[PDB]
Amino acid sequence: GPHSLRYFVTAVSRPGLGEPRYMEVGYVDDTEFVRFDSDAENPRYEPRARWMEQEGPEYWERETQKAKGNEQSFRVDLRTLLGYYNQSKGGSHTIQVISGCEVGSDGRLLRGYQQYAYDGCDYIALNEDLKTWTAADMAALITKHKWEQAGEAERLRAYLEGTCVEWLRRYLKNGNATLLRTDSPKAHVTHHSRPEDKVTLRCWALGFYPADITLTWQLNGEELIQDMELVETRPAGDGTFQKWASVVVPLGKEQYYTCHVYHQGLPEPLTLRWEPPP
Amino acid sequence: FAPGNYPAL
Amino acid sequence: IQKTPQIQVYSRHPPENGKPNILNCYVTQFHPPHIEIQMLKNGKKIPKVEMSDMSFSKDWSFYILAHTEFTPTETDTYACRVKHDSMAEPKTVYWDRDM
């Protein structure tokens, strides 16, 4: 079981409407666990998972201070980038960052992340070697040469290999149980027809966590990849997810098709068919 | 640990 | 470099006429993050619509969930309307109780 601790940060300039909007969201194994939002009179880092309420006021105070420090730095960065791209001060612009660490089941670093984007596009990223940067355009080359000269990469490598890992281990101790939770899908097949010689069988999976799941339809042995309609997995809004997969089949041949639901909360994959009770 | 103090772009 | 929102409209629970439920409007894959989301009942704006906090995914694109309480009936039409700089006109997606 590998694990990760990552922070997703957003700064959006709002010329004429106030100060930039600033957001930090922290994730342990892709599960949101803290959040800072600048849109408040006294913005504070907040717990987003009940197992984080164990942390004392010192922790929260320090996180809040850092967030406020990052907010100011991003306010400067937004201005710098207007210059690099020679853009007007009247436009809204976005800087995004993904920063953090994933470690193996042994607790050691597998990957360090530090990726920046400007207006939804790659700007600059720390390579997997944790020593060099990839710049995506001419503007990012300025940042790159600056950071190389000042040896920023090695300072950042230290944080990622040390502090990041250490905090991840701490957060896992308090939240591991919660993070390992699984809700298995309840599945069923619905049947739809307009006045025509075909029908639609829709295989549904509901109330499941985590989001990762696979649905297939089988005719005979073979899976029907090309013919299926699929929707993206989506939140029910209560912490669980939904998905469905559907196939158009000949009228009267419903019982030749089988739906399969694969999910880690299932001891064995579910198999099911259209089943009219009357 | 967020953390703070990233270098300027 | 703008990205066009994708939209799904659907209920939290399987719909049953006269039984309270939640209607969701899930909007993903969009950039910039400023976006306007309305939920409509028979063409008329539903006033009490709550919004989750925003997030973004590994490809930088943003996503958010709008929702509202509702009690479905046989004949009521629902929809979700989204306005975003990536599109000339607002995009409207109708609720299909089979989807």
Calculate ∠ Cα A262-A267-A272, nearest 5°: 50
CA distances from A220 to A37, A67, A257, A258, A260 (A): 53, 57, 7, 8, 13
Show which of A181, A201, A217 is a domain's final residue.
A181
User: What is the rounded radius of gyration, in angstroms, for the C-alpha atoms of chain B?
Assistant: 7
Shared-domain flag, residues A233 and A246: yes
Residues 6+ apart with CB under 8 A from C86: C2, C3, C4, C5, C30, C31
What is the rounded distance in angstroms from the CA atom of residue A277 to the CA atom of residue A274?
10
Shared-domain flag, residues A62 and A175: yes
Using alpha carbons, select from A111, A116, A166, A121 the residue that is nearest to residue A9: A116
Peptide bond into A185 cis (omega under 30): no
Shared-domain flag, residues A177 and A190: no
In chain C, domain spans: 1-99
Q: For residue A65, which residues of chain B lie inside 8 Å, CB to CB? A: 4
Q: What is the resolution in angstroms?
A: 2.3
Spatial contact of A97 and A9, defined as CB atoms under 8 Å apart: yes
Spatial contact of A177 and A31, defined as CB atoms under 8 Å apart: no
Shared-domain flag, residues A257 and A220: yes
Segments in chain A forming alpha helices (H)? 57-84, 138-149, 152-159, 165-179
Shared-domain flag, residues A38 and A150: yes
Amino acid identity at A155: R
Q: Which residues of C touch A (CB under 8 A)?
A: 1-3, 6, 8, 10, 12-14, 22, 24, 26, 28, 31-34, 53-56, 58, 60-61, 65, 67, 98-99
Shared-domain flag, residues A213 and A91: no
CA distances from A212 to A103, A182, A201, A242, A246 (A): 20, 11, 22, 10, 18
What is the rounded distance in angstroms from the CA atom of residue B7 to the CA atom of residue A146?
10
Interface test with C, best of A6, A8, A48 (most C CBs within 10 A): A8
Spatial contact of A245 and A189, defined as CB atoms under 8 Å apart: no
Experimental technique used to determine this entry = X-ray
- Among A76, A77, A159, select the one facing B3 at the smallest CB separation: A159
Which fold would CATH assign to domain C1-99? Immunoglobulin-like (2.60.40)
Neighbours of A86 (CB within 10 A): 7
Q: Is B in contact with A (3 or more beta carbon pairs below 8 Å)?
A: yes
Spatial contact of A10 and A19, defined as CB atoms under 8 Å apart: no
Q: For residue A231, which residues of chain C lie inside 8 Å, CB to CB? A: 8, 99
| Partner-chain contact B6 A73, CB within 8 Å | yes
Q: Is A in contact with C (3 or more beta carbon pairs below 8 Å)?
A: yes
What is the rounded distance in angstroms from the CA atom of residue A243 to the CA atom of residue A233?
5
Q: Which residues of A touch C (CB under 8 A)?
A: 8, 10, 12, 23, 25, 32, 35, 37, 92, 94, 96, 98, 117, 119-121, 190, 192, 202, 206, 231-232, 234-238, 242, 244
A213: CATH = 2.60.40.10
A101: CATH = 3.30.500.10
DSSP string, C12-43: SS---TTS-EEEEEEEEEEBSS--EEEEEETT
- Among B1, B5, B6, select the one facing A164 at the smallest CB separation: B1
Burial of C68 (0-12, 13-18, 19+ CB in 10 A): middle
Strand, coil or helix: A273: coil
Give all chains having 3 or more CB-to-CB distances under 8 Å with chain B.
Answer: A
Number of domains in chain A: 2
Among chain B residues, the shortest Cα distance to A67 is held by B4
